[PDB]
Design a binder for this molecule. Structure first.
Ligand SMILES: [Cr+3]
Ligand SMILES: [Cr+3]
Length: 327
DNA sequence: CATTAGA
DNA sequence: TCTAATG
């Protein structure tokens, strides 16, 4: 957690580079299990050799460790951090829409900067276009004060269209967070569960609603169960307009909400931990359900859920307010 | 780890 | 169809 820091961070920097700037999925995979393993190790790595005893730890990384241990740096690390092309890819990727593949491509093309991207808005797809259009605002945080106002409106039209709609703003927001990065809304309707073969419109209805009133202003991707947009709070009585903000809506079988809700609310650790527990408590938790284990090794048979509570009750735990679902 | 775009 | 990009 800190004894092995520098090794782990250098290592991940090592990993992420083969992954993006190069196409070294393997090398890249390599740096991670190592950076993972050296993370666990309860003692101060003193030398490569020492490290080396480890699992996944090879000659290659070992060699790494020493230079890092010995000198407060790493050239390869110092040469990449410097490398303009490489840099370039790391940069371009901030463009929502831009992944490594694309990054590289554009680079090969000569497109390295933001401006480069403007000059060739053609070479870009709608997504990317957007991305590009909302780069600053996309990278900005979202004040809960704002989280509140958005949530507000959103629950309004939801309700407005059909009063039989259940929305919940999951995530860190849900979890009290003084700030968030994009709002996620979990949706469901009685009229849609596991088997009841859809009602795409279900989703449809609402996005449409949101647009109609100006909530949603773009569309990144609209599907029958998963919309992924952009939003903006009606800039008041002038002098102050709201920045563009990512948003995502999702349909869900009424019959699989709460798990989902439970789930999406995190925190990553709260989940894992709760989940781990469910294993003792003779169960299984996953993003959609909760099945009772059968000694044979495994089992199934999704237990019925009407609230965040059922799941809790199920594994006989203390209801944890989302506030303190931190871990 | 599943959903969407796109070519 | 496969491939990329989000989450
Ligand atoms: Cr990206
Ligand atoms: Cr998200």
């Amino acid at each position: 957690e800190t004894l092995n820091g520098g090794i782990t961070d250098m290592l991940t920097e090592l990993a992420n580079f083969e992954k993006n700037v190069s196409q070294a999925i393997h090398k890249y995979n390599a740096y991670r299990k190592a950076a993972s393993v050296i993370a666990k190790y309860p003692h101060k790595i003193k030398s490569g050799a020492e490290a080396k005893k480890l699992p996944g730890v090879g000659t290659k990384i070992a060699e790494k460790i020493d230079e890092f241990l010995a000198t407060g740096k790493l050239r390869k690390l110092e040469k990449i951090r410097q490398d303009d092309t490489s840099s370039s890819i790391n940069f371009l990727t901030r463009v929502s829409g831009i992944g490594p593949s694309a990054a590289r491509k554009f680079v090969d093309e000569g497109i390295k900067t933001l401006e480069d991207l403007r000059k060739n808005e053609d070479k870009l797809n709608h997504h990317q276009r957007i991305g590009l259009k909302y780069f600053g605002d996309f990278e900005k945080r979202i004040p809960r004060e704002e989280m509140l106002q958005m949530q507000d409106i959103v629950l309004n039209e939801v309700k407005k269209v059909d009063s039989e709609y259940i929305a919940t703003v999951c995530g860190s927001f849900r979890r009290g967070a003084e700030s968030s990065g994009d709002m996620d809304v979990l949706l469901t309707h009685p009229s849609f569960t596991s088997e009841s073969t859809k009602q795409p419109k279900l989703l449809h209805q609402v996005v449409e609603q949101l647009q109609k009133v100006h909530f949603i202003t773009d569309t990144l991707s609209k599907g029958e169960t998963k919309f992924m947009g952009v939003c903006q709070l009606p800039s008041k009585n002038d002098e102050k307009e709201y920045p563009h903000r990512r948003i995502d809506i999702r349909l869900i079988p009424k019959d699989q909400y709460y798990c989902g809700v439970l789930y999406f609310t995190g925190s990553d650790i709260f989940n894992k931990n709760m989940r781990a527990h469910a294993l003792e408590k003779g169960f299984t938790i996953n993003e959609y359900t909760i099945r009772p284990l059968g000694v044979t090794g495994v089992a199934g048979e999704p237990l019925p859920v009407d609230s965040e509570k059922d799941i809790f009750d199920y594994i006989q735990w203390k209801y944890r307010e989302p506030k303190d679902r931190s871990e």
